Structures are given as structure tokens and as C-alpha cells.
Amino acid sequence: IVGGYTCGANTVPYQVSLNSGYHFCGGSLINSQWVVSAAHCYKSGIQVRLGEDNINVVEGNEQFISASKSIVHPSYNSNTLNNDIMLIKLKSAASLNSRVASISLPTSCASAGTQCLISGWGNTKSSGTSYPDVLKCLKAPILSDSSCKSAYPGQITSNMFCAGYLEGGKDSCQGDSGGPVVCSGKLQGIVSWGSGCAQKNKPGVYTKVCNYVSWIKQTIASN
Numbered sequence: 001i002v003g004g005y006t007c008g009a010n011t012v013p014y015q016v017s018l019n020s021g022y023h024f025c026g027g028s029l030i031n032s033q034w035v036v037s038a039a040h041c042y043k044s045g046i047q048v049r050l051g052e053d054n055i056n057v058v059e060g061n062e063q064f065i066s067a068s069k070s071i072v073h074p075s076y077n078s079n080t081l082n083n084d085i086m087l088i089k090l091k092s093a094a095s096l097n098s099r100v101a102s103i104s105l106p107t108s109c110a111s112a113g114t115q116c117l118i119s120g121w122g123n124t125k126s127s128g129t130s131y132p133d134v135l136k137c138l139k140a141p142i143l144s145d146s147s148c149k150s151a152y153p154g155q156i157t158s159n160m161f162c163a164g165y166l167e168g169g170k171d172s173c174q175g176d177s178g179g180p181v182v183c184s185g186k187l188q189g190i191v192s193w194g195s196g197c198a199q200k201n202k203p204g205v206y207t208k209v210c211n212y213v214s215w216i217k218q219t220i221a222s223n
């Protein structure tokens with residue numbers, strides 16, 4: 001997260017760190033056995049790390065659970081990043097408590113102007129490299145589809161939305177991918193992509209989770 005702030009330990013209890021020997025993507029715990037992340041975060045041998053703050057120190061509230069099954073969206077297109085969503089079933093159920101909790105799926109789509117909380121252990125530099133060991137947070141409003149489509153001509157589909165600042169300075173970044181974009185307690189987006197981090201007029205693009213609730217529910221119910 002660029003231009004964000006330190007969230008604080010376990011203040012984003014649904015945030016998960018997808019680990020394959022190291023943190024590579026974020027995710028959101030949607031229930032005790034399921035994590036939602038970006039399909040572009042797909043990897044084999046994903047160990048889901050819950051209750052994380054400092055990803056390099058065992059602080060005592062972590063739950064490291066290996067994935068049993070990964071389900072990338074049937075229409076995920078790695079070229080356009082359309083349908084950039086993936087479900088990860090945990091081998092064993094996460095013990096949900098105050099530091100590790102699920103985030104609610106949206107009942108409706110969030111709109112432009114909606115303020116959201118984006119979190120991740122991604123790069124904090126817009127021009128440079130610095131990865132935080134502790135979870136970073138960023139408050140960013142969902143931008144209007146017009147601003148989004150104008151920033152990314154012909155690249156924004158109905159399953160995407162821009163969130164952030166057109167002035168740049170604040171944005172998701174590498175390593176934040178798959179992370180949650182929660183607005184008013186509901187997971188409305190998944191850190192999907194951007195042309196860079198915190199670039200002027202190039203807001204981050206997120207997977208519009210509200211378009212996948214049916215798929216998410218149906219998938220979970222049958223796996």
C-alpha cells in the first residue's frame with residue numbers, strides 16, 4: 001500500500017497472507033474454510049496465514065492453514081484481468097475469534113464515492129521498493145466508472161471498479177494483490193491491478209466482488 005498507514009495488529013481480522021514460503025498475495029477470509037483472493041494470485045501450495053500483522057514474526061495469533069482446494073473463477077482472463085477472483089478452501093477450518101474473522105460478502109454493489117479500506121503487505125513505494133512487515137491500510141473512495149474507464153480506456157469491465165486518488169500518492173501496489181477492499185464492513189473489491197502504484201490519474205482497479213456473490217456462494221456450497 002502506497003501512502004497508507006499502519007493498520008494496527010489484527011485490526012483487519014479478515015486479511016489473510018497467502019504464503020508459499022513468503023507472502024505473495026493477500027486475501028479475505030469469507031468464512032472459516034474459505035478465502036477469497038485474486039485469481040492472478042493463483043499458486044499451488046498456498047498456505048493461508050490468518051491472524052497476521054508482522055508477517056516475519058510469530059506474534060502468537062497466527063493460524064497457518066494449507067489450502068485444500070483452489071478455485072479460480074471459470075471466466076478469469078489473465079490478459080484482461082477480468083473475473084480476477086479465486087476461492088481457496090482451507091484444509092482445516094480457521095478458528096474464528098477477534099483477531100481472525102471473516103468479512104461479509106456484499107448484498108449490493110458499492111458505488112462511486114463509497115469510502116473503502118484497502119489493506120496489504122504490498123510495496124509502499126510508488127517509485128522504489130519497500131515491503132512492510134506489518135499490515136498497511138489505505139482509505140480510498142470508489143471512483144466513478146467514467147473516471148475509471150477514462151483512466152483505463154477499454155480495460156475496465158463490469159467486474160471492475162477503480163478506487164483511490166486520481167492525484168496519485170495513495171494506492172495499492174505489488175503484494176497487495178488479492179487483498180480486501182472493504183467498504184462499510186462488506187468485501188466490495190479485491191486488489192486486482194493498476195498500471196503502477198500511486199500514479200497520477202491511474203487509480204487502482206479492483207475486482208467488483210458484488211458480481212461474484214452468487215458464484216462464491218454456489219461454489220462454497222458444493223465444495
Ligand SMILES: O=C(C1CCN(c2ccncc2)CC1)N1CCN(S(=O)(=O)c2ccc3cc(Cl)ccc3c2)CC1
Pocket residue numbers: 079080081155171172173174175176177191192193194195196197203204205206
Ligand atoms: O500494469 C500492470 C499490468 C496490469 C494489468 N494489465 C491490463 C492489461 C489489459 N487490460 C487490463 C489490465 C496489464 C499490465 N502492472 C504494473 C503494476 N504492477 S504492480 O506494481 O505489481 C501492481 C500490482 C497490483 C496492483 C493492484 C492495484 Cl489495486 C493497484 C496497483 C497495482 C500495481 C502489476 C503489473
Ligand SMILES: [Ca+2]
Pocket residue numbers: 052053054055056057058059060062
Ligand atoms: Ca506474524
